[PDB]
Amino acid sequence: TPVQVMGVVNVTQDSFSDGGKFIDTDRAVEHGLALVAAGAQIIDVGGESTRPGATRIDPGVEAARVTPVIRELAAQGITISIDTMHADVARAALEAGAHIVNDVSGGRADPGMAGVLAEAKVPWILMHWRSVDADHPHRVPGYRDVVAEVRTELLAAVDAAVTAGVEPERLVIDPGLGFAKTAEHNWALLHALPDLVATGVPVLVGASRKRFLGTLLAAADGTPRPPDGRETATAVISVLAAMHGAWGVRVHDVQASVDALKVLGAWTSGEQIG
């Protein structure tokens, strides 16, 4: 039972991050093909961003961006997750060939998401993000115990999914590192990863390039490490997550995490025989 490496393809970021004017399906498809060639088991396709100050787009535009990419990658037999909070977008992505729904709201953004998943009978990833104030969706709340509360709320989301008719075997949970959480919250959640794995629900970890790695690796004068300088740290997290029973890791740099997991595998089996 090896850890699943989930490589990220965001069609909007691929098309626009370096200044491009037009949506570029072919670039995103070639990106996904390259991540598969580098060892990804799952390609997570997204059309939106949730970070502060992102460009905001209609769900119709979100779907129009992801579905051509999903259609071409699915035609190559690739396993594809759709990274969306919007039920209508998830449904369109499933029509296009996605086989997993990755919901950073954990079903809380769209009351129709549970019904989409219950009907489609595909896996549903429920990420933890406590976001009571839509005017401040990233504000860090007061946790008495972030470890216990994340677990409680993820399992409550699992319960609501099952009540809606999703089969328990099809749920995945994700602690949502960095989403209304401090760096210290993240490290407590990661140290407690075995506890969350012990729920029996598959656990996905997404640490790749997140702000707490910029903080961890800050320069002597306080300047955080830029996102490109966070990849060694991200790959080490993939290894420690794998060692502690994570079902999957969500990463941008698939090659670096695959390299790291090959080291873990070669070390572990180094004295085996026969």
Q: What is the contact surface with ligand PMM in residues (CB under 6 A)?
A: 8, 83, 102, 104, 125, 127, 174, 176-177, 204, 206, 208-209, 250
Helix or strand or coil: residue 148? helix
In whole angstroms, what is the distance from residue 175 CA to residue 136 CA?
A: 20
Kindly give the pairing relationship between strand 4-10 and strand 42-46.
parallel
Considering the complex, what minimum distance in angstroms separates the CB of residue 203 from ligand PMM? 10
Considering the complex, what minimum distance in angstroms separates the CB of residue 125 from ligand PMM? 5
Nearer to ligand PMM, 176 or 214 (CB): 176
Catalytic residue among 65, 130, 170, 210: 210
Catalytic residue among 108, 130, 230, 250: 250
Question: Among candidates 19, 21, 73, 12, which has minimal Cα distance to 43?
Answer: 73
Which amino acid is located at 259 in the chain?
D
Query: Is the alpha carbon torsion for 36, 40, 45, 50 positive or negative?
Result: negative
Asked if 121 is an active-site residue, the reply is no
Nearer to ligand PMM, 170 or 250 (CB): 250
Asked if 108 is an active-site residue, the reply is no
Buried/exposed 183-207: b ≥16 CB within 10 Å, e otherwise:
bebbebbbebbeebbeeebbbbbbb
Tokens of 225: 């490490």
Considering the complex, what minimum distance in angstroms separates the CB of residue 162 from ligand PMM? 19
Nearer to ligand PMM, 125 or 221 (CB): 125
Considering the complex, what minimum distance in angstroms separates the CB of residue 186 from ligand PMM? 10
In whole angstroms, what is the distance from residue 10 CA to residue 26 CA?
A: 12
At CA 267, angle to CA 266 and CA 270, rounded to 5? 80
Considering the complex, what minimum distance in angstroms separates the CB of residue 165 from ligand PMM? 22
Longest Cα separation, the chain: 61
Which amino acid is located at 128 in the chain?
H
Length of the chain: 274
In whole angstroms, what is the distance from residue 23 CA to residue 130 CA?
A: 32
Nearer to ligand PMM, 8 or 66 (CB): 8
Give the nearest residue (CB) to ligand PMM: 206
In whole angstroms, what is the distance from residue 28 CA to residue 9 CA?
A: 6
Considering the complex, what minimum distance in angstroms separates the CB of residue 51 from ligand PMM? 7
| DSSP single-letter state for residue 2 | P
Active site residues: 210, 250
